[PDB]
Amino acid sequence: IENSAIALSGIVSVANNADNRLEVFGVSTDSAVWHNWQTAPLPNSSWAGWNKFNGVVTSKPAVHRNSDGRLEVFVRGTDNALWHNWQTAADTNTWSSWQPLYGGITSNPEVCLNSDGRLEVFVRGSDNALWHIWQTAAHTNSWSNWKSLGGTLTSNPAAHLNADGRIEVFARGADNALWHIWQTAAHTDQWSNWQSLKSVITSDPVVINNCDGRLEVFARGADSTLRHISQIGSDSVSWSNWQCLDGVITSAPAAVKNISGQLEVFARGADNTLWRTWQTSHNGPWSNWSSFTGIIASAPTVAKNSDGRIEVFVLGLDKALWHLWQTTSSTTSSWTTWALIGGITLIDASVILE
Amino acid sequence: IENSAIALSGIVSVANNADNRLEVFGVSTDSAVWHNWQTAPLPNSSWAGWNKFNGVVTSKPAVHRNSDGRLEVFVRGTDNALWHNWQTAADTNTWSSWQPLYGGITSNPEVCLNSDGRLEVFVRGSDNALWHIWQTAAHTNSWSNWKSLGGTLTSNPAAHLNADGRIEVFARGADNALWHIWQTAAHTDQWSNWQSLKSVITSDPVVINNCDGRLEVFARGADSTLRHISQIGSDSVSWSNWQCLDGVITSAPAAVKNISGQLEVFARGADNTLWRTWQTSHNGPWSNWSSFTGIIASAPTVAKNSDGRIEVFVLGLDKALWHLWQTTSSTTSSWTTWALIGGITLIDASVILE
Amino acid sequence: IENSAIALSGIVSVANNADNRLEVFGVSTDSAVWHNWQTAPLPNSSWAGWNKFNGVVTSKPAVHRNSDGRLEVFVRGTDNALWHNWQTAADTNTWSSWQPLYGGITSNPEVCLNSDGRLEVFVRGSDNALWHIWQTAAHTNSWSNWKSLGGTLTSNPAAHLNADGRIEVFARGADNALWHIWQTAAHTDQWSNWQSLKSVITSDPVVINNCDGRLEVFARGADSTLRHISQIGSDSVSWSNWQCLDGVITSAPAAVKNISGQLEVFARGADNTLWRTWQTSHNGPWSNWSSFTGIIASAPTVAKNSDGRIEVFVLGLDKALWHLWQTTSSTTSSWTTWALIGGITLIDASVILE
Amino acid sequence: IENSAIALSGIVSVANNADNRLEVFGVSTDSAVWHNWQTAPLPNSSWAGWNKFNGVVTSKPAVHRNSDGRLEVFVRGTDNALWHNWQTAADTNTWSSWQPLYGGITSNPEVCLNSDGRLEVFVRGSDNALWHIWQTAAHTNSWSNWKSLGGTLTSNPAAHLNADGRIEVFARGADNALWHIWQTAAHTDQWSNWQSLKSVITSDPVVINNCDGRLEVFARGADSTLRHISQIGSDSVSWSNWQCLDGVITSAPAAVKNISGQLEVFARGADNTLWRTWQTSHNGPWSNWSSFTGIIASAPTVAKNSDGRIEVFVLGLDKALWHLWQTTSSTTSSWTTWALIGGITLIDASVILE
Numbered sequence A, B, C, D: 001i002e003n004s005a006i007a008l009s010g011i012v013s014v015a016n017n018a019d020n021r022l023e024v025f026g027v028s029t030d031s032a033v034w035h036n037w038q039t040a041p042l043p044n045s046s047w048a049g050w051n052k053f054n055g056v057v058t059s060k061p062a063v064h065r066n067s068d069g070r071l072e073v074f075v076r077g078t079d080n081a082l083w084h085n086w087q088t089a090a091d092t093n094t095w096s097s098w099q100p101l102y103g104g105i106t107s108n109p110e111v112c113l114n115s116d117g118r119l120e121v122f123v124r125g126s127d128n129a130l131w132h133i134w135q136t137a138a139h140t141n142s143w144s145n146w147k148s149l150g151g152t153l154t155s156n157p158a159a160h161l162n163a164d165g166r167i168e169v170f171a172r173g174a175d176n177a178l179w180h181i182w183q184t185a186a187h188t189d190q191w192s193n194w195q196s197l198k199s200v201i202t203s204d205p206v207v208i209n210n211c212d213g214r215l216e217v218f219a220r221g222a223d224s225t226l227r228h229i230s231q232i233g234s235d236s237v238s239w240s241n242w243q244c245l246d247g248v249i250t251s252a253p254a255a256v257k258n259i260s261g262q263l264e265v266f267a268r269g270a271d272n273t274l275w276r277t278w279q280t281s282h283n284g285p286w287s288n289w290s291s292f293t294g295i296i297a298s299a300p301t302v303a304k305n306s307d308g309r310i311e312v313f314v315l316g317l318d319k320a321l322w323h324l325w326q327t328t329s330s331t332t333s334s335w336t337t338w339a340l341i342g343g344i345t346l347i348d349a350s351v352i353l354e
Ligand SMILES: C[C@@H]1O[C@@H](O)[C@@H](O)[C@H](O)[C@@H]1O
Pocket: A150, A151, A152, A153, A172, A173, A174, A175, A179, A194
């Protein structure tokens, strides 16, 4: 692979509803967003069926739960501006129409919740810089003007809250290295300069928080293996060295923290099946990758159920959405085999960044 | 102290709003509930002033945030039944009137959020058993009938979610030991039998979750010192031995998990000042207690701000509410000295359990 | 029990030979020291039989392995002075006669190895202060003069190396609290002043090193339960608060670090059987005590075999030495039941400190 | 670099004497072994000066301390057989002549101490298999016959005790992967078959024990960076995945466990200076490499002083031995700059394995 490659992304965005039911969002062959959901937060739950939002879209959709429980989806439109829609009541299938947030968008949108309850969206803009826009009041349809954070992006952005409430954004730069920028006071429009974490990544970065409040970042490297880095913590503003893990992966990775507090990472492997690795102990070494039966056609998208059970979604060879999950909450739970969520097929609507 | 004593409780209940502003609830000399809140989730924020809910009450009030962000308060009424009121919109000072949930209540109420978004309330009933009632749909004013969990309670109940979504309830029993009972499937009406954790406690139990998903319980013991016990974990249904910490305490303890993942405990000490102890490392030993200047007249009530800063509320010698807090998010942050939240005085409305 | 009680001690001293065979030393009804050893460092090993050192003694004997592998035993004599004898070659049953080190001794002797290979002995002296004497060259029969470290002791001393090579000595003081004093430079005659760790202990203190280089001290408390305290570490000269563990114990405790790095403690329990508790995780909480069948008449003495298997020695109701051990090296190994090491009976020769 | 390269090795072997004084062994331009030692185990200690053992040698020498404190050195002779010499008394400069152990040796020798006090030596033999020979009685000049462990070696062997007393040997195989073989009962002639840890290493393997009893192995990889792997533990016979650390290294690595229980690794870096990395927390992530001033001409050899202070030895550009060390025992201690141990120059006598 080339240093400037971006690994295959996930095919849906997933969220937990206010009642913790999983709900997924993808783009079908009509270039419209469709969604589907569990009807109950139970291990046996049926799924409602695929329901369409009217409107042609031009990016992967991004979803986040508002601080009042209402889901809200962000997507690029036919006019290359940002659009969004939302549940008008938590846990209810009453949605707004797509509504305009304007701007000129050249990446998939990335949405984060500030620690004061206000949603905030990050995109690459028409000048390849990072731009953002936010709710000016928690869970309200009052949005700011667009504002630039500068930089030159060559990946989609990835945003995450630090334990102290400061949003931090990660993105690949013009030199194919991982760069990052952050709020310097929680949920305030006060930002750092861009700083480089070095190395070379060949996927979007993926970021998760450890129990102990340290951010950890995962990405595919130049040699096509998983690599990761973490904050040193203790009021330090330093990071660890990079480590790679053996095993060639062929999609973006997806990270999750299990209910035991340990990290797990999923990715499509060299044989195009789903691979999983997990920390064997607190901060510990990582297990050899383990494989699930079945060839997959997207990166995994990983979520957790109301009872902590991990669930994974992927594009199948039939171009439909499949999922599998842990049967019980235990960290040693067995897993199901891939099952179909049928009724539509999906396309990869991700913005082509080059 | 006698084995059957119940240590002095906190004087307010505290919650985070959907936007993470702190809001406190207490009972004034008119035997009505009043509340006060931060106007913004900032370290410098002013407080709105004391506002009254009309209605005479006969217990300490209990507050919880619904899964749609709306706060909801539970209290015993003049008729010894359960009453509740709620914000009609998240982050808004538009409240319902007190509305009836009926029942015969002989303890302070305790409220928990199930992992499927439904509030659930636990009380001691007219026959001294544990009784509960719940929302039948997430964040909706549809409630179940009252149902008995049996037992004989001599403390208020304390409820907490396990990492796998199962509510677990702790309460002192007829033998003055700590007992507990739990959902055996997450957010389902399937409960265990009562089981004893043994020992003798002289306060309500206080329960918190560790990073690694293990519950930890704190209480004052027969010798008036803090003692604690924790789940062994690893799909075990066993608990650790009890450990006590040196230092005589004179109120209920209050536990909090800081943004570094470590536990801290606050309690009024033998000299009637606020004492604090913290885990020195991951699961580690506990620090010697450290003292804050100022004589206090209630147990502490502890909360965290939107940026992770710990904040403590207590009754003063003037019978008014005071608070102090960490000045920065760091675990080594300095602390302020007690400041007054003036305008009313408070009484301890806790139900007298004997 | 009274605050000034000293819990029943172990009946033998145990050491590993240069080849790691266990060897035990006790006092028989002739008031002479006898010893016995494994003939091979194997799980099935026979024991050689009881062999007598000629000479009447007046304390429990203390044994340590020199830095050249030779065992060396220290004891108080009929003249109340210190005497010692030694293997003249490692792993060989060729011993010196008892040889004089003089002094006036009013406690059992305690021996430690400095980090530069020189043995050092600590005793309470005729004026109740701590006194010490040392090899002036590693593993050589050249000893210093007696020198005083001051203080007032009401227990036998317990000495242990810090991770940085500094000997630290623990002993109960005139106020029945735990006190300690330490080298301020490794293996040098430069010592701190006495400092109090506070509390009240009713046994000799027992000290062990954690993996992470922090000393941890165990003792019985005023309420007859096990209590413990540890160094905070990180170049701090502070200690944790004291914690007690539920369960009444009736002898001195014995601590050991298993080959997994976790601490375990053994003690005679309230029912006069052997009890065991272990840390359930890294620095973690402690297990409920578990009991071994059989009434015992001394504190346990605990050792580790060449393969890490834990082995325990106690006085039986027949006044003979019994032992049991782990059958395999695993931390979850099963245990044998008490077996007799027959041929002599033993007395408790410990110096009566009052 | 090629997959079959073996990274530059250290220029001396180092041991602690019975009194913990450091002593180093190297080969000079006369192809004889010389040694030098600290005169006292102190931070300021002078060194004795270079002293020659008569006899021409044909490998790097290997040194180990016997279980009776006497150092013993192993080397290949002019006849390609194994030779050894020893201190005849601990801590004394009275040495045997080189004495024969015979055999046909095609690697540097590697020496380990069994958990029953018997030295054991591992070499590649005339048929490229692993061969070994051992003391049949602890610290005695009675040796076994040579015996084969099979395999095909392309690196020098590296041997280490498991926490349970079983020797484990690591060596690169015919496929350039890391292989290992182990005693299946502690200090017994009962061995496993060879098993592969996979990957590709371009240096000798280096093995150390973690506090928690798990072996960890370090080696340079095919991409010239440091990589490492560890035992999973918990009576499992599994290992972690491999991880690499960013940073090109140009010698064998040297690992050490500091007195805080954390691992540190030293290696010559891409700019031919000494680099150091350390675990930032328990099992934690690894720091970015830090550099010491000065170009070096060998891998580092790392030791610990009697007080825990880390000390490093390297070949200088003048072909003499240099060292630097921590000034205090603290983990954050400052370091000295390179100082000369003058009087001879050294050559790399390592056996050329191809
Ligand atoms: C995001 C970063 O912004 C500037 O610093 C560029 O010079 C970097 O190459 C990178 O694109």
